[PDB]
């Protein structure tokens with residue numbers, strides 16, 4: 001169950017964090033799951049402070065890296 | 080100053096409050112800050128210097144005020160600056176870059 005939709009970054013509401021959280025909750029559902037990242041535009045930060053004001057996307061990337069691997073559990077299975 | 084509360088009520092002079100720490104690169108600095116936060120007598124929030132140095136003129140300075148406006152709104156806080164070298168202006172006066180604005 002790959003992402004397949006990272007380009008759908010956000011609405012005008014700052015729901016992107018909730019969206020990515022739901023993505024990883026769907027990940028935790030069907031625990032043996034591997035998430036493929038298209039790695040296009042939701043991976044924006046080249047320098048972390050110069051691309052597109054570091055706005056919505058900077059929060060998205062911060063959340064993504066924060067939750068990417070919290071050493072949760074082996075049984076989690078999220079690759 | 081907090082534990083010995085009654086005496087410090089009599090203090091007629093502003094309490095020493097700021098401390099700075101050099102160190103050979105990364106010899107335990109954020110972890111120390113984290114622990115001194117977790118003593119929990121004070122709340123903690125922190126900024127990492129390269130995060131806020133936007134190219135945009137306004138945000139570059141507005142992001143500093145973003146911290147204080149929240150800190151003053153809650154409680155005594157640490158307001159730790161990591162990577163503070165990157166904010167510091169290297170005593171620059173001629174170029175008058177955005178760094179001068181921020182400092």
Ligand SMILES: Nc1ncnc2c1ncn2[C@@H]1O[C@H](COP(=O)(O)OP(=O)(O)O)[C@@H](O)[C@H]1O
Nearest residue numbers: 102103104105106107108109110111112161162
């Ligand atoms: N005395 C120590 N005890 C435990 N960990 C330490 C100690 N000294 C350094 N470290 C480790 O080094 C890092 C200290 O944080 P920091 O100095 O901010 O690293 P950096 O500057 O590279 O971000 C952490 O990864 C911490 O685990």
